[PDB]
Ligand binder design. Structure first.
Ligand code: FRU
Ligand code: FRU
Ligand code: FRU
Ligand code: FRU
Ligand code: CA
Ligand code: CA
Lengths: 381, 381, 381, 381
């Protein structure tokens, strides 16, 4: 996990959302020293447990109420239970990763500080801060608007199904914990995306520096710069590996949540489109599909960009080789080429899969297979 | 995108079809200088928007008519809507790529000019021009014949379903925009195929030159020739990467369109074969299947050939190494081998997949899975 | 294609079966010179066309008879038509490959002669001849027994369905061409398996020679032997590539035929097991499943073995490097290691897939997917 | 297969379970010499045959009884038959591997002895013995508890279905052989997991030794140590290959058994959850699902860990290269890097698949596809 001053807002968001139980102090040098915060550790654990318990209690209450709102039919019951469980698992994995990833965070931040010192010429504090804050604000505003629309639609629906001998508004009220879990999930995804995008951006800056310092006494300093760039590349690869070892289970559960959410939301939209019983519900389902796809991209695109930027440095090094005649510089470039030959750049989600754009294709196939089956089941019943 | 004098006819076809908004002037040296053409840029954008709007308006009119011709049943409505939407997305992606790919086109054409100067001995202006014109004419004639057959069959069908209190011929007339979109798609596919086949042909010419100049004072010029060949190989790889970065979304949407078209056309053919209500409709559906498969091959085979030709140069270089004793020539061949070791030859469609013949197998599986399901749905209903 | 004296029996079998239209003369040196045989070329083409026409004519006659035997229901009609068409396509592809693969055959046989001269110490004429004849005899006897069982079972069935106003035995008689196509397919598969197994066996002999001459004046001859072994390895790789370029479409159609045959035969067996209307039919279906799986292995295992044997030579070369101190021998071993680093050993079926054991797993999944669907369709109807 | 004094308990368990027909004598040096034990060879073969025959006889008796307990419906009959057959095949493959893998076992144990002598500094006899005994005891206790729960639940069920004119308790008694087969399968899986985890642990110890002896006269001994470490790495790779060549069919059948068991157990749990006819049966089905998933991990995680540990040594070697200046040590590290460049670390199950965590994802998809279909079939019927 990345904790930097420009992105300190995302860190605070994750901290109040039970995902970053760390205490950060800004040194007089502008560096952010990080340590364990037991107060926030226990706060995060207790909040996660309490919110999960409340979410499942509300689910049971809806299922066991006089007039269930969402948990009405067996198919609807199972689909909504899976929808809640995927979010619960994703947030639990994120919280667990944030709790037991302090050493990885420290190592990643030290490596990033060294790399930024190496790549100080391409650092943009203002632009990085604004990008991080914009991404966080957009994600939070989108999820807030979507939650408001969903809760209003479900409130209106429950009012339509209201009977004088029972209150169905409380059934919708009891689903608030699920939306809180959604906010926590949004914060976790924002943090992961920020870290991965930072790694990819640093890879791109390293490649730009390589191409601008070698393709556009003195040779000794140039070789020193090349050695520093190679060290930065290896350190960025190790930072990617640390991010994987820390949040791979979280990313895997986020991907599973995206898949199941797309399937279930498409199924519900198809149901409402066949019955044509409501229109706001249909539009809210389309908005949910768009949000789920956007967050799937949020978790996929960063790793793909990082791998792409890291794997294109070898071509630059080959060009340098073909355009370098100095002995020691040629040897340094040869060392860099050998180092790049054996880089593991792709992001691994606990070894289950490689997080890149190809996953999307697979997802589509899965969404094309399960959804249809669900439609077939609906026709059968 | 490739814009060369031999293939200038394909460029003009794409230009009048809203896919190549570029102004080309032939220099006194025989070179084609390319620049932005704002008149044709706005013409392409406006034509694309207007034709898409007309296509969807005709779709809605058919769906909302007294006697729908194609958009009659829910299954038929959805299938025809997807059929129109895939074409719309493919042409929109092609137009967008042509609008925002001027720099890539310029770089690709400069690289191709340099490579052709390097490989001037194997250039065939007459044969290249005739191949390009033949491919373009065959594609346009096939799509025109297919559109005529489809529109005539649908006109006859609508006449069969005609009732004295409504006109169903106008419903078929309103589908003309969809066929115009088909023509635009054919032009885009022809342009992409021409560019990719040119890249693969240049790879093959480079390999032939390598095998004929090294396996079938003077050594200094031979090493110079080898350096030029290696530069041409790297430039061809970069041209493939430019073509990908420019038209990957277009190729991905073309592949999706081919998949969904094969599925839907097979479903319609199966419907008519069960009902046995018509024969010309069945034959037109078979012709559509053949056309879709042929264009899928048109978009797949070029990339596969390019990758195959680029990946077989390393064996030639190894043979040269084993058959070269000169010091400087041996060093140049070693450099070439190292360069070839790390080439990314496969064509990437926005990173979602690698465009090669293997895709076809996957496609078959997909076509075997979805189609069957659709058949199962038909049986259920 | 391989044409050697030990395996000349397989060549003659393929020749009388319209798959090897070549004239072979044994030189006084024991070498087999190969040339085009126009008499057998036209014989093969005419026989293939005539047998395909007769097979489809018998299919139509069964479908259009008073009491169809096999082509009775729409599902049965489609399944039997696909069963006949896959065999027809496989044999047509094999015949086409044999017709237009004379140059590849000549090159492969020259390369194999050179390799055998290099590996003369491990050549076993008697064992190779006996293995080839045993494989051919086993395949032909198995297909003959299976055809006899199938035709007898279908004759008995047609007698059971016989009515005084029609003869159903002629319907079974008209399916003889399909069994002739099966014999041709068996011959083609035997030839392909013999060639691929020969390539893999030569790879294994090369590896054994490497391990016995280097891991178990004089150094100059040892380096000469190593150079010959490296040349033999590259020549075996090129022979594999020639076999692919010649019979890849045939192997692809054989794989498709195996897949569809397994699916259809399992479906028919499941039908008869639900109806429990016959027992000999069930056992014949199990025998057909076993034969199809055995020939799938016959076409898969050879390529897998060849790739495995070719890819394990690099480890032997690394051991030699770690155990070689001589300068020129060390340089030769380094050259061999570099050559082995970039070998394309896997067999490619026209680029659609890599023929190895992994395919089997995919096949299973496919057989698990389509078959079930077919069962689901049967339940629906 | 690994046979070491710390894990001698697992060896004895496998020996009395018909999986390790070897006689082991502990030498005065503490080494375990291994040889063939014909008494235990015939005991293992006879026990396997007898238990398989009894299992299938009990299956038939249940199917042919007055009141079948498990083999009642066609769907239930097929599912239970497949459940028994997968276990039978897995245990038969394990027994066959143990019978015909004496040479591989001897080679693996010699290699492991040499490696342990090389890595003596990181050997922990007490910890290894306790881990092996704990894994064996946990597996055996879990399977025993699960078998007791299953047999008690089925006994109670058969008592519920008891009629005065027939005894259904004997039907459950006749399924004891299936549980004995389950115990044999658990022993085989424990042995395979122990061997693979030992290989991965030795890989990790080798990497730790590399990082602690090079990254945390004398140079000659350091190079000797590096040569020994490289030899140990190659020997561990060859040990992994021996384990594959010996037990790949067993691992493949174990994976198939896990897949089919998960599918069938989930189907049965879904059945009981729809009928809601019992609760203990539901909980036993959940326990069975957990046990099957845990053993799938038991067979997958070891190979993944071994490959991961073996593939991360190249990065350590690159760091050593970048941090080594001595001539002979630099040459040794270069040799080690070249050796590591071409390592085949992944475990292969007879070439059908690579055993790693990715398989799990595929499994899920399969479980998501077949299970649903089975549910669809249940709805249809
Ligand atoms: O199920 C449809 C949508 O409703 C939600 O549960 C929100 O309450 C989302 O998880 C899903 O996208
Ligand atoms: O749907 C069957 C065929 O009809 C078309 O829509 C043409 O109007 C094609 O897209 C398709 O191949
Ligand atoms: O269809 C079941 C079996 O019958 C055959 O058609 C033989 O006539 C085979 O192709 C198939 O294995
Ligand atoms: O089928 C459900 C469960 O019952 C068993 O057969 C045990 O007797 C297991 O193989 C399976 O997990
Ligand atoms: Ca499926
Ligand atoms: Ca169905």
């Amino acid at each position: 996990m990345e904790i930097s001053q420009p992105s300190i807002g995302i860190f605070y968001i994750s901290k109040v959302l039970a995902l970053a139980p760390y205490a950060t102090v800004r040194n007089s040098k502008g560096r952010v020293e990080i340590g364990r915060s037991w107060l926030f550790t226990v706060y995060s654990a207790t909040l996660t447990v309490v919110m999960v318990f409340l979410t499942y209690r509300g689910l049971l209450f809806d299922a066991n109420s006089e007039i269930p709102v969402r948990m009405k039919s067996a198919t609807s019951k199972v689909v909504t239970a899976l929808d809640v469980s995927v979010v619960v698992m994703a947030i639990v994995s994120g919280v667990y990763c944030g709790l037991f990833s302090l050493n990885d965070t420290l190592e990643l931040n030290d490596r990033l500080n060294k790399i930024d010192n190496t790549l100080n010429a391409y650092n943009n504090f203002r632009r990085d801060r604004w990008r991080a804050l914009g991404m966080a604000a957009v994600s939070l505003l989108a999820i807030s608007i979507l939650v408001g629309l969903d809760v209003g639609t479900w409130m209106r629906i429950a009012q339509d199904m209201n009977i004088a001998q029972s209150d169905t508004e409380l059934n919708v009220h009891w689903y608030i914990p699920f939306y809180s879990l959604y906010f926590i999930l949004t914060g976790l995804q924002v943090n992961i995306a920020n870290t991965a995008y930072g790694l990819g951006r640093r890879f791109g800056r390293l490649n730009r520096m390589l191409s601008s310092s070698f393709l556009a006494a003195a040779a000794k300093n140039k070789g020193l710069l090349l050695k520093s760039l190679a060290d930065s590349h290896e350190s960025l690869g190790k930072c990617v590996h640390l991010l994987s070892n820390s949040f791979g289970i979280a990313v895997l559960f986020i991907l599973v949540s995206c898949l199941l959410h797309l399937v279930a939301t498409a199924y519900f939209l198809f149901l409402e489109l066949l019955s044509k019983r409501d229109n706001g519900y249909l539009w809210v389902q389309m908005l949910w599909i768009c949000f789920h796809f956007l967050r799937l991209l949020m978790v996929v695109e960063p790793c793909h960009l990082a791998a792409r930027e890291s794997r294109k440095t070898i071509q630059i090094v080959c060009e340098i080789e073909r355009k370098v005649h100095e002995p020691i510089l040629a040897e340094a470039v040869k060392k860099f080429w050998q180092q790049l030959l054996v880089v593991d750049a792709d992001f691994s989600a606990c070894g289950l899969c490689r997080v890149n754009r190809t996953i999307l294709t697979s997802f589509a196939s899965a969404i094309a297979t399960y959804l249809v089956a669900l439609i077939q089941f609906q026709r059968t019943n």
